C-alpha cells in the first residue's frame, strides 16, 4: 500500500535508537520520549509500532541478525578455496562491519549490558553462529584431531574472540592485522591439539 510509509517510520524509530547509542549511552537508559523525538513523532505514536522499549530492543536484535548472517554466508562461500582462508574472511567481515557500523555497535554494547530479555535474544543469535561454525569445521574436516565435544569448545572460542573484538572495530597493530594474527594463534592451536 502506502503502509510502505509505516515501515519507514518503523525504521526511523530503530535507526534513531541505534544512533542515540553512538555517544556512549546504553540502550537501557534511553527514554521512549527521546527516541520518538529523534525519529520525528509525537511520543504516543510510538505505540502504533511497539508497546515497549524492550520490544524495540528485540527488533534491534532481529535486524543485526539478518545482517550478521548475510555476512557469515559470504565467509562460508569463501571457505571452499585452498589457501588464504583467514585473511580473506577477515576482510569480508571488516567490510560488512564498516558498511553497517551502528547495528554492530548495538550488538557490541548490548551483548552483556542490556535487560535480560535482550541478553537472551543475543545469546540465541550467538549459539546459532557458534553451532553453524562447529558444523562447518565438521563438514570440511579442518580440525581432524577434534571430536564433536572439542569442536563445540573451539567454535565457542572463535565466536568469543570475534564478539570480543567488535568494539575496537567500531571507531602493525591495526584492527585487521591484529585480529588475523589472533585468529591464526587459535587455528594453530586447533591443528596441534592431541
Ligand X SMILES: CCCCCCCC/C=C\CCCCCCCC(=O)O
Partner DNA sequence: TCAGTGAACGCTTGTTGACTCGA
- Binding-site residue positions for CoA: 184, 192, 194
d(CA 80, CA 85): 9
Considering only 28-36, 93-101, 102-110, 143-151, which stretch makes contact with DNA by CB under 7 A? 28-36
Among 87, 131, 136, 152, binds ligand X (CB under 6 A): 136
Q: 147 with 194: CB under 8 angstroms? A: no
Q: For residue 83, give the C-alpha cell.
A: 589457501
Site for DNA in 46-75 (CB under 7 A): 47-49, 52-53
Breaks in the chain (C–N > 2.5 Å) following residue: 171
Site for ligand X in 116-135 (CB under 6 A): 129, 132-133
Among 11, 26, 31, 140, binds DNA (CB under 7 A): 31
Size of interface with DNA, in residues (CB under 7 A): 22
Give φ, ψ of 8 to 5 degrees: -60, -35
23 binds DNA (CB under 7 A): no
Considering only 27-35, 48-56, 87-95, 107-115, which stretch makes contact with ligand X by CB under 6 A? 87-95
Nearer to a second copy, 47 or 185 (CB): 185
Binding-site partner at residue 9 among ligand X, a second copy, DNA, none, CB < 5 to 8 Å by type: DNA
39 binds ligand X (CB under 6 A): no
What DSSP assignment string belongs to 117-178? HHHHHHHHHHHHHHHHHHHHHHHHTS-TT--HHHHHHHHHHHHHHHHHHGGGG-----HHHH
d(CA 52, CA 21): 17
d(CA 50, CA 2): 19
Among 141, 143, 130, 149, which Cα is nearest to 186's? 143
Per CB under 7 A, residues contacting DNA are 1-3, 5-6, 8-9, 31-34, 40-45, 47-49, 52-53
Per CB under 8 A, residues contacting a second copy are 23-26, 28-29, 108-116, 119, 149-150, 152-154, 156-157, 160-161, 163-165, 167, 173, 178, 181-182, 184-193
Amino acid at each position: 500500500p502506502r503502509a510502505e510509509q509505516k515501515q519507514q517510520t518503523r525504521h526511523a524509530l530503530m535507526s534513531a535508537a541505534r544512533h542515540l547509542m553512538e555517544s556512549g549511552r546504553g540502550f537501557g537508559s534511553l527514554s521512549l520520549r527521546e527516541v520518538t523525538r529523534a525519529a520525528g513523532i509525537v511520543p504516543a505514536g510510538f505505540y502504533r509500532h511497539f508497546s515497549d522499549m524492550d520490544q524495540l530492543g528485540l527488533a534491534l536484535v532481529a535486524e543485526v541478525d539478518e545482517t550478521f548472517r548475510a555476512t557469515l554466508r559470504a565467509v562460508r562461500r569463501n571457505e571452499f578455496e585452498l589457501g588464504g582462508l583467514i585473511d580473506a574472511s577477515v576482510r569480508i567481515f571488516l567490510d560488512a562491519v564498516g558498511a553497517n557500523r551502528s547495528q554492530f555497535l548495538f550488538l557490541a554494547r548490548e551483548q552483556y549490558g542490556g535487560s535480560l530479555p535482550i541478553r537472551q535474544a543475543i545469546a540465541s543469535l550467538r549459539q546459532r553462529i557458534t553451532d553453524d561454525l562447529a558444523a562447518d569445521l565438521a563438514l570440511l574436516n579442518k580440525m581432524p584431531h577434534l571430536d564433536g565435544a572439542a569442536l563445540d569448545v573451539f567454535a565457542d572460542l572463535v565466536v568469543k574472540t570475534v564478539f570480543a573484538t567488535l568494539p575496537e572495530l567500531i571507531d602493525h597493530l591495526m584492527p585487521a592485522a591484529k585480529i588475523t594474527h589472533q585468529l591464526r594463534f587459535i587455528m594453530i592451536g586447533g591443528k596441534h591439539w592431541h
